Structures are given as C-alpha cells and as structure tokens.
Design an enzyme around this catalytic site. Structure first.
Site, PDB file in Angstrom:
ATOM      1  N   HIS A 298     -10.248  -5.580  12.302  1.00 21.16           N
ATOM      2  CA  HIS A 298      -8.884  -5.919  12.581  1.00 21.16           C
ATOM      3  C   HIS A 298      -8.550  -6.193  14.050  1.00 21.16           C
ATOM      4  CE1 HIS A 298      -7.724  -5.823   8.389  1.00 21.16           C
ATOM      5  NE2 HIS A 298      -7.570  -4.551   8.357  1.00 21.16           N
TER       6      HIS A 298
ATOM      7  N   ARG B 115      -7.608   7.136  18.152  1.00 17.66           N
ATOM      8  CA  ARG B 115      -8.158   7.101  16.775  1.00 17.66           C
ATOM      9  C   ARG B 115      -9.382   7.938  16.749  1.00 17.66           C
ATOM     10  NH1 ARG B 115      -6.336   1.110  14.789  1.00 17.66           N
ATOM     11  NH2 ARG B 115      -5.947   1.949  12.673  1.00 17.66           N
TER      12      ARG B 115
ATOM     13  N   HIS C  83     -10.722   1.285   4.774  1.00 13.44           N
ATOM     14  CA  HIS C  83     -10.486  -0.088   5.183  1.00 13.44           C
ATOM     15  C   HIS C  83     -10.970  -1.035   4.089  1.00 13.44           C
ATOM     16  CE1 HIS C  83     -11.037  -3.479   8.115  1.00 13.44           C
ATOM     17  NE2 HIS C  83     -12.268  -3.540   7.694  1.00 13.44           N
ATOM     18  N   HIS C  84     -10.815  -2.372   4.104  1.00 15.77           N
ATOM     19  CA  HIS C  84     -11.041  -3.273   2.970  1.00 15.77           C
ATOM     20  C   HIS C  84     -11.817  -4.512   3.313  1.00 15.77           C
ATOM     21  CE1 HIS C  84      -8.242  -0.541   1.220  1.00 15.77           C
ATOM     22  NE2 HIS C  84      -7.180  -1.147   1.714  1.00 15.77           N
TER      23      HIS C  84
ATOM     24  N   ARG D 297       0.806  -1.229   0.000  1.00 18.17           N
ATOM     25  CA  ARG D 297       0.000   0.000   0.000  1.00 18.17           C
ATOM     26  C   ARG D 297       0.812   1.238   0.000  1.00 18.17           C
ATOM     27  NH1 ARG D 297      -4.290  -0.859   2.126  1.00 18.17           N
ATOM     28  NH2 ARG D 297      -5.012   0.568   3.739  1.00 18.17           N
TER      29      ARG D 297
ATOM     30  N   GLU E  65     -11.349   6.397   8.534  1.00 15.86           N
ATOM     31  CA  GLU E  65     -10.295   5.628   7.852  1.00 15.86           C
ATOM     32  C   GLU E  65     -10.821   4.825   6.700  1.00 15.86           C
ATOM     33  OE1 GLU E  65      -7.591   3.594  10.934  1.00 15.86           O
ATOM     34  OE2 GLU E  65      -8.955   4.809  11.978  1.00 15.86           O
TER      35      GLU E  65
ATOM     36  N   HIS F 207     -12.798   0.069  12.186  1.00 15.50           N
ATOM     37  CA  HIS F 207     -11.506  -0.443  11.687  1.00 15.50           C
ATOM     38  C   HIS F 207     -10.920  -1.407  12.700  1.00 15.50           C
ATOM     39  CE1 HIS F 207      -7.156  -0.263  10.530  1.00 15.50           C
ATOM     40  NE2 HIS F 207      -7.840  -0.439   9.447  1.00 15.50           N
TER      41      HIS F 207
END
EC number: 3.1.-.-
Lengths: 134, 86
Positions: free
Chosen positions: A131, A96, A102-103, A5, A100, A127
């Site tokens: 994760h 945070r 994210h995928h 990335r 964001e 996120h």
C-alpha cells in the site's frame, strides 16, 4: 462512505497448510496466507466487523497448539485475548508494531474481504510496501 | 498528561509495574499496549525496546523482573543516568 470492511458478514475460506514457523514469513512475497486450522473454525460464522473477525483468527492461533508455539507469555496472552502479536526490530516500522491482515486484491477493484484465501498475514513493513507508504 | 518524562523518574518497582502490565496485556485494547510499549522505549533510550519484550534473546530470562534487571545492567554498562533514587 466507510468502506465495507466495517459492516457485518459471513466468513468464507478453505485455507493454507502451514507450519509453525508461519509468523516469520509475513515479510516474504506478499505475506503468509491464513491457515486451514483457523479457517475451519470460521466457516460461515457471522462476524460484525473485520476487527471482530481479527479477534477470532488470533485467538484460534492460541487454541491451536502449533500456531502460537513460537510465541512467548506476553505474545501468548495477547493472542488468547484476540489481539495481534508483534514484530522483530527489522519489521516494526516506528508506529506500526503489530501483525496485520492484508489482501491480495485491492478492495476497490473487487477484493473479497471476508474470504480467507485472500487474507495475508503481513508485518508492518509488508502492509506499508504494497500500500505504498500509507 | 500524566506521563513520565523519562526512566529517571520511575523508581525500579514502578518500571517493573509498567512491564508486568505490558507482559500480561493488562488493559482493554491493543491500541493502548502499542502506546505503552512506545512509552517504555522512548523513556529508557534503548534501541530495540519493544522486540526485547516480544522476541526473547536466547540467554536472557523473559519475565517482567528479568527484563527490568536487563534494563538495570544496560544503563550501568553504557554509563547512563540510571532510574530515580531507589
């Protein structure tokens, strides 16, 4: 090795028909996917990193009159300087605080990074959810 | 480093200056402004902190001045130390 990335590439996408309230949904399901309006402008443009991608996306948000509409002056200057808007007090998780990207697929198991159909707008709380803490 | 200890060492016009900086994103990275807004909160004690600036409550005037004349009232309602001697 640094994960792929932060390296140069071409942006690909179609994108989803959203509405202006899209930023509230980034803590639903798996996040809100990227709008068709931002993706049309990024259709096979070369980017130099994901962050460089992220700058552009957020800025097309301020140039599209419907997408930055729900934002106030402070988030609106942010977005038009390429930076992520922030979240409500139910969604900022201590450190945070910003929105964001994210995928849907994990990078390590064939996740296409520069392909907008896989990139979900998430709040921190989301996120962190998929994760699993990190 | 050159950090303030709490709100009780800003006079109001300095705190005003810190929010104006924040509310126009008067800096070069994002990763500054996340640390400027975290400083705002942990100094003034107020639980919501960031979200006051970033998602306005209907009834409040969302500009640096107005945000500071909200902090002024908050402090004096709950009975806290206030700013420095102005």
């Amino acid at each position: 090795m640094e994960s792929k990335r932060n390296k140069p590439g071409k942006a690909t996408g179609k994108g989803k028909p959203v509405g202006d309230k899209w930023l509230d949904d980034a803590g639903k399901d798996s996040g809100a996917p990227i709008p068709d309006r931002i993706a049309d402008k990024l259709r096979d443009k070369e980017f130099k990193s994901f962050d460089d991608f992220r700058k552009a996306v957020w800025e097309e948000v301020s140039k599209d009159p419907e997408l930055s509409k729900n934002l106030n002056p402070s988030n609106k200057s942010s977005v038009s300087k390429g930076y992520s808007p922030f979240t409500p007090k139910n969604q900022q998780v201590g450190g945070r605080k910003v929105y964001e990207l994210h995928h849907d697929k994990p990078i390590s198991q064939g996740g296409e990074v520069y392909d907008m159909d896989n990139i979900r707008v998430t709040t921190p709380k989301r996120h962190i959810d998929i994760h699993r803490g990190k | 480093m050159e950090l303030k200890h709490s709100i009780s060492d800003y006079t109001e016009a300095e705190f005003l200056q810190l929010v104006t900086t924040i509310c126009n994103a008067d800096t070069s990275s994002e990763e500054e402004l996340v640390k400027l807004v975290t400083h705002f909160e942990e100094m003034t004690e107020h639980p919501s902190g960031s979200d006051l600036i970033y998602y306005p409550k209907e009834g409040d005037d969302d500009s640096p001045s107005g945000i500071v004349n909200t902090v002024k009232q908050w402090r004096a309602a709950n009975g806290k130390s206030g700013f420095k001697q102005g």
